[PDB]
Amino acid sequence: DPLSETKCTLKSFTVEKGIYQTSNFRVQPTESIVRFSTNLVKNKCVNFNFNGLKGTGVLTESNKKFLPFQQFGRDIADTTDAVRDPQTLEILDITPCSFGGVSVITPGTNTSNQVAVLYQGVNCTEVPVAIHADQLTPTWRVYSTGSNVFQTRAGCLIGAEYVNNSYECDIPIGAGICASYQTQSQSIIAYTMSLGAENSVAYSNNSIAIPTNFTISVTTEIL
Amino acid sequence: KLIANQFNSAIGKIQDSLSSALGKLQDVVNHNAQALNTLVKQLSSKFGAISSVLNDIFSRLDPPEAEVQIDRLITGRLQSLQTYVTQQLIRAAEIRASANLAATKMSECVLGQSKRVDFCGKGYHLMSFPQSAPHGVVFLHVTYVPAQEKNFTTAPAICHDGKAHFPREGVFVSNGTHWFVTQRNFYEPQIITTDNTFVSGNCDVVIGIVNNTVYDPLQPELDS
Amino acid sequence: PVSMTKTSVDCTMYICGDSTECSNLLLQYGSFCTQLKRALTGIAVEQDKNTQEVFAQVKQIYKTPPIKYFGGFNFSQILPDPSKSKRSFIEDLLFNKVTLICAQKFKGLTVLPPLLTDEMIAQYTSALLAGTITSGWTFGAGAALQIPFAMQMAYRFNGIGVTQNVLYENQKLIANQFNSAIGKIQDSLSSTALGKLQDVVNHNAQALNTLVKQLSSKFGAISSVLNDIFSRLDPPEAEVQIDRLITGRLQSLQTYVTQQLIRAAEIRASANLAATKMSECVLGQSKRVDFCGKGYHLMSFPQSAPHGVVFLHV
Ligand SMILES: *[C@@H]1O[C@H](CO)[C@@H](O)[C@H](O)[C@H]1NC(C)=O
Numbered sequence: 001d002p003l004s005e006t007k008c009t010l011k012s013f014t015v016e017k018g019i020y021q022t023s024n025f026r027v028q029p030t031e032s033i034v035r036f037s038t039n040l041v042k043n044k045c046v047n048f049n050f051n052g053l054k055g056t057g058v059l060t061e062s063n064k065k066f067l068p069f070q071q072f073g074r075d076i077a078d079t080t081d082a083v084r085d086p087q088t089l090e091i092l093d094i095t096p097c098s099f100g101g102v103s104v105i106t107p108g109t110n111t112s113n114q115v116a117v118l119y120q121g122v123n124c125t126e127v128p129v130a131i132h133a134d135q136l137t138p139t140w141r142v143y144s145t146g147s148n149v150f151q152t153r154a155g156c157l158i159g160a161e162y163v164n165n166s167y168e169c170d171i172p173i174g175a176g177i178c179a180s181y182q183t184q185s186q187s188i189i190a191y192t193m194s195l196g197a198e199n200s201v202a203y204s205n206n207s208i209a210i211p212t213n214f215t216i217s218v219t220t221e222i223l
Numbered sequence: 224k225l226i227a228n229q230f231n232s233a234i235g236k237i238q239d240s241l242s243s244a245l246g247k248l249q250d251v252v253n254h255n256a257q258a259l260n261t262l263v264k265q266l267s268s269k270f271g272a273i274s275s276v277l278n279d280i281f282s283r284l285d286p287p288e289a290e291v292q293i294d295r296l297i298t299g300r301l302q303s304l305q306t307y308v309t310q311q312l313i314r315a316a317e318i319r320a321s322a323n324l325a326a327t328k329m330s331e332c333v334l335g336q337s338k339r340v341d342f343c344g345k346g347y348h349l350m351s352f353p354q355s356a357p358h359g360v361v362f363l364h365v366t367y368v369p370a371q372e373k374n375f376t377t378a379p380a381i382c383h384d385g386k387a388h389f390p391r392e393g394v395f396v397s398n399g400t401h402w403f404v405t406q407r408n409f410y411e412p413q414i415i416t417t418d419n420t421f422v423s424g425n426c427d428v429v430i431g432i433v434n435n436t437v438y439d440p441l442q443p444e445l446d447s
Numbered sequence: 448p449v450s451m452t453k454t455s456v457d458c459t460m461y462i463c464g465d466s467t468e469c470s471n472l473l474l475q476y477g478s479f480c481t482q483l484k485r486a487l488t489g490i491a492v493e494q495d496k497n498t499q500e501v502f503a504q505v506k507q508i509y510k511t512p513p514i515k516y517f518g519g520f521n522f523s524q525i526l527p528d529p530s531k532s533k534r535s536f537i538e539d540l541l542f543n544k545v546t547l548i549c550a551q552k553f554k555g556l557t558v559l560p561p562l563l564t565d566e567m568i569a570q571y572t573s574a575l576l577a578g579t580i581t582s583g584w585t586f587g588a589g590a591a592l593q594i595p596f597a598m599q600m601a602y603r604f605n606g607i608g609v610t611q612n613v614l615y616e617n618q619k620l621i622a623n624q625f626n627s628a629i630g631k632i633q634d635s636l637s638s639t640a641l642g643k644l645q646d647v648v649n650h651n652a653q654a655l656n657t658l659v660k661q662l663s664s665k666f667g668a669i670s671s672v673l674n675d676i677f678s679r680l681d682p683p684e685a686e687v688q689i690d691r692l693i694t695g696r697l698q699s700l701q702t703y704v705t706q707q708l709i710r711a712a713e714i715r716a717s718a719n720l721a722a723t724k725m726s727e728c729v730l731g732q733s734k735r736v737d738f739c740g741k742g743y744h745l746m747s748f749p750q751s752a753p754h755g756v757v758f759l760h761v
Pocket residue numbers: 123124125
C-alpha cells in the first residue's frame with residue numbers, strides 16, 4: 001500500500017496528516033542481455049552489455065543520430081545516454097527505468113487509511129506505462145489507474161476527487177492544488193486553494209470611511 | 224470600562240486558545256530529538272566494514288586488516304558526527320536569528336510602543352506583554368483594531384471668506400448637508416473652527432474644495 | 448529574493464541508478480539518506496512558508512474600481528490587466544527579465560513546483576496594491592477604510608512632516624512627477640538590474656550542475672560506472688570499490704545539501720526582510736531612514752518577480 005510504503009519510509013505505523021515523499025520500495029525483475037548473443041528486448045527495464053557498456057535501463061528508439069565513428073553516446077553525468085549495438089548498427093536511447101517520485105497525500109492514519117498518490121512530473125495517460133503497473137500488486141494497480149485521476153502541473157494525482165469549490169489549504173500538493181479529508185462518505189478531495197474572500201473597496205472622489213468604534217484585541221506571537 | 228472589558232475578554236480568548244498553536248517550540252524540540260536519534264541510529268551502520276560494533280572486528284581480524292576496517296568505521300562515524308555538528312550550527316544560526324528578532328520585539332514592543340506595521344500584532348499596536356515558554360518567548364500584543372466603519376462625504380479643504388482652510392490634525396466629513404471636522408481613527412464630529420483648521424492659500428488652487436462656514440470663537444465673545 | 452527552487456533527490460537513483468547490489472549497500476549506510484531527505488523537505492516547506500509570509504499578508508482579496516482615476520495618479524503600468532496570467536506591465540517586464548532539467552530528472556534530482564503559482568502571487572500583489580491605493584494603511588490595521596487618494600497622499604505628507612497645503616497646491620505637479628518616475632522605472636526595466644534573482648537561479652542551477660558532474664568521478668575507485676567494477680573485480684573486492692564510490696557520492700550529496708541549507712537560511716533571512724518591508728512600507732508609511740527608499744518615504748507598491756518581490760518605493 002502507498003500508505004504502508006509511507007510507513008516504511010517514515011519508520012512508523014502512525015502517519016500524520018500531510019504529504020510524504022516515499023522511496024521506490026517496490027522491486028522489479030531485470031533480464032540480462034549480452035550482445036557483442038542474446039535477443040534484444042525493448043521498452044522495458046533490462047540489464048545490458050552492449051559492446052562492454054555495462055549499465056541497466058529501458059531501451060527505446062532514438063531520434064538522435066551518431067556519426068559513423070561513434071559507437072555510443074554519453075550524457076552530462078558521464079553515464080551512457082545513447083548506444084549503437086554492433087550486431088545491428090541501430091541507435092538505442094537509454095531511458096532509465098522510469099520512476100517518478102511517489103508522494104502519498106494522507107490524512108491521519110488514525111483518521112483514515114484512505115490515501116492519494118501523486119506521481120511527480122509524469123503524464124496521467126502514461127502513468128501505467130511509467131511505473132510498470134503490470135508487474136506490481138493489484139493494490140498498486142488501484143492507485144496506478146482507475147477513477148479519480150486528475151492532472152496538476154506538479155504531476156498526476158490518483159485517489160483524490162477534484163472539486164471546483166476553493167477551500168483553505170490543508171495538505172499542500174503544489175501549484176495551488178491542495179487536498180483535504182472532507183465530507184462529500186468522507187473522502188479525500190483536491191481543490192485549487194482559496195486566497196481569501198473577494199472584496200471591493202468603494203472608492204470615490206469624496207467618500208471616506210471612518211470607524212465609530214473599535215476592538216482591543218490581544219494576539220499571541222510565539223518566538 | 225469598555226476597553227477594560229474588551230481587554231479581559233481578549234485575555235480569556237488567549238486562555239481558551241492555549242488551553243484547547245505552539246508549533247515552533249515543539250518543532251525545535253523535535254528537530255533536536257530527531258537529530259540525536261539519527262546520530263544514535265547511525266551507529267548501526269557498518270560503513271562497508273564486516274560489522275557495526277568494534278569488538279568483533281578486533282577479535283576476528285588480525286591487527287593489519289582491522290586497522291583498515293576500523294579506519295573505515297572511524298571516518299564514517301566522524302562524517303556522521305560532522306553532519307550533526309554542521310546541522311546543529313545551521314539550526315543554531317536560525318535560532319540566533321529568531322532570538323535577535325525576539326530581543327528586538329522585546330525592546331520595540333514590550334519596552335515601548337511601535338509605529339512599525341505588523342511588527343507587534345495586526346492592528347494599531349498599543350503594548351505587549353512577555354511570557355516565558357519552553358525555549359522561547361510568547362508576546363501578548365495588545366492592538367487597537369478599528370471597527371464599525373461608517374461612510375461619509377469628505378472634502379480636502381473649506382472655502383471661507385475667499386480662503387482655503389485645511390485641518391490641523393483630522394479630516395472634513397459631512398452627515399448629508401452638514402460638514403464637520405473629526406479625527407481619522409475614531410468618529411468624533413466637531414464644529415469646523417479656526418482653532419481646529421488652519422488657513423492657507425486661496426480656493427482656486429485646491430481641487431475638490433467646497434464651501435462652508437468656519438466658526439470663529441472670538442465673534443460671540445465680542446458681542447458678549 | 449523570497450523563494451528558492453525546491454529540489455528533492457532520490458538516493459537510490461542518484462548514487463546507484465538501477466543497480467540492485469548498490470541499493471543493498473546503500474541500505475547498509477541506512478539513516479544517512481533519510482537525514483538528507485528531511486533537510487530538503489524542510490527546505491521546500493520553508494520556501495513555501497517564505498512565499499506565504501511575504502505575499503499573503505492580507506486576509507481579503509481587494510479589487511480596484513472599474514474606473515481608475517486616483518487623484519490624477521497613473522497606476523495603469525502597475526495595475527494588472529484583464530487581457531492576459533493576469534499580471535501588470537511592470538510585472539511582465541520583471542518576469543521577462545529573469546529566465547538540462549531532463550538530465551537532472553534522469554539522475555533523481557527533481558524540482559518541486561511552488562505551492563503558490565505566479566498567477567496566485569500576482570493576485571496577492573494586486574490585492575495588496577488595490578488595498579494600498581483605495582484604503583492607504585487602513586487595510587493593514589483592520590477592515591479596508593475607503594479614502595480619496597489625494598487625501599491619502601496628504602496623510603503621507605503629514606507622516607513625513609510636510610503641511611497638507613503643499614500637495615493641494617501642487618497636485619498636478621506631484622501626479623506628473625509620479626507618472627514620469629513610473630515611466631523611468633519602466634525604461635530602466637525594459638531598456639536595461641535584477642541581479643539578485645538571477646544570482647539565486649544561477650546558484651541553484653550551478654549547484655545542481657555540480658551535483659550532476661560529481662557522478663563522473665571515480666573518487667579513487669577504478670571506474671565511475673557501478674556495473675563495470677562489479678565485472679572487473681572479485682565480489683568481495685568490488686564491495687570495497689563501490690563502498691568507496693557510495694562514500695564519495697554521499698559526501699558530494701552532503702556537500703550539496705549543506706550548501707543548500709546555508710543558501711536556504713540566507714533566502715529565509717531575505718524573505719523575512721521582504722515580509723518586514725511589505726508590512727512596514729506597503730501596508731503603512733515608514734519613518735525608518737532608507738528602509739523604504741532614499742527620501743522621506745511616502746508609500747510603496749509590491750510587484751511579483753521570479754522567486755522574489757520588487758518594491759516600488761515612492
Ligand atoms: C498528456 O496527455 C494528453 C492526452 O494524451 C496530451 O494532450 C498532453 O499533451 C500530454 N502532456 C504531455 C506533457 O505529454
